[PDB]
């Protein structure tokens with residue numbers, strides 16, 4: 209009963225719904241097979257991520273998903289974001305079809321690839337060598353910055369940029385997810401802990417947390433936290449600090465320490481992102497360039 213948009217509309221019968229991937233505040237995401245997403249190859253199979261309303265959804269849940277859908281249409285296509293592939297709005301439940309990232313989110317990607325502990329018996333010629341190396345970590349940070357730069361150019365604010373909201377493809381390409389979402393910024397439970405133990409308040413810029421102000425520079429703050437996540441290989445920010453203590457510490461201008469095995473260049477970028485005045489933080493364009501210099505200097 210929603211209006212037909214032939215540009216994006218995809219026949220729902222060309223989808224085979226598979227195993228659920230996860231669920232958000234509004235909507236659930238399910239893995240699925242798509243046939244003929246490329247109209248030039250009608251019988252070609254591809255793996256996609258389908259977002260849909262949960263069971264017994266409210267009208268506001270529908271409005272939020274519709275709102276997300278329209279943002280996806282306007283945002284355009286970029287290598288480092290989750291792109292819209294199609295929609296199903298006609299004669300059936302609302303489907304928002306987007307790209308699927310085979311390796312899950314960036315946080316779990318890093319945590320599952322932490323170096324072998326010294327408790328492990330030396331077996332082979334590279335026993336100390338873990339899956340993750342410094343240039344690849346830098347590349348991950350660079351890709352997120354480029355993706356955010358694109359989103360910024362499209363006047364899009366993420367409001368919850370983090371490792372958990374960055375997805376990893378089969379080719380280890382970073383793709384920013386859930387960027388055009390209504391997140392109820394006027395009613396945030398700052399003490400709320402997710403089912404996986406995450407405290408989303410630890411990613412909020414001071415002007416966002418204290419003054420409910422969101423800009424692209426507030427995302428830059430979040431990017432700084434995301435930088436810390438990457439080079440702690442999926443660690444949780446402000447270790448062992450409860451939300452109540454986080455409040456007072458932030459008011460005192462407290463910042464996270466430099467993590468182990470992290471070069472001063474990158475902790476330098478982190479601290480720049482965490483400058484109190486938003487105009488004293490780098491832009492994403494500057495972050496891209498700065499991370500590019502480091503990346504090129506370690507890609508001989």
Ligand SMILES: *C(=O)c1nc2c(C(=O)Nc3cc(O[C@H](C)c4c(Cl)cncc4Cl)c(C#N)cn3)cn(CCN3CCOCC3)c2cc1Br
Nearest residue numbers: 229230237255257290306307308309310311312313372385
């Ligand atoms: C399809 O390529 C595919 N995807 C995954 C994912 C996965 O996370 N896919 C995914 C999730 C998306 O959003 C959800 C809500 C999400 C989750 Cl589930 C987790 N964190 C953040 C977000 Cl946004 C979106 C979107 N939009 C797109 N794609 C996870 N897996 C399994 C990972 N698996 C773990 C065990 O080792 C092997 C890898 C897959 C698999 C596949 Br085929």
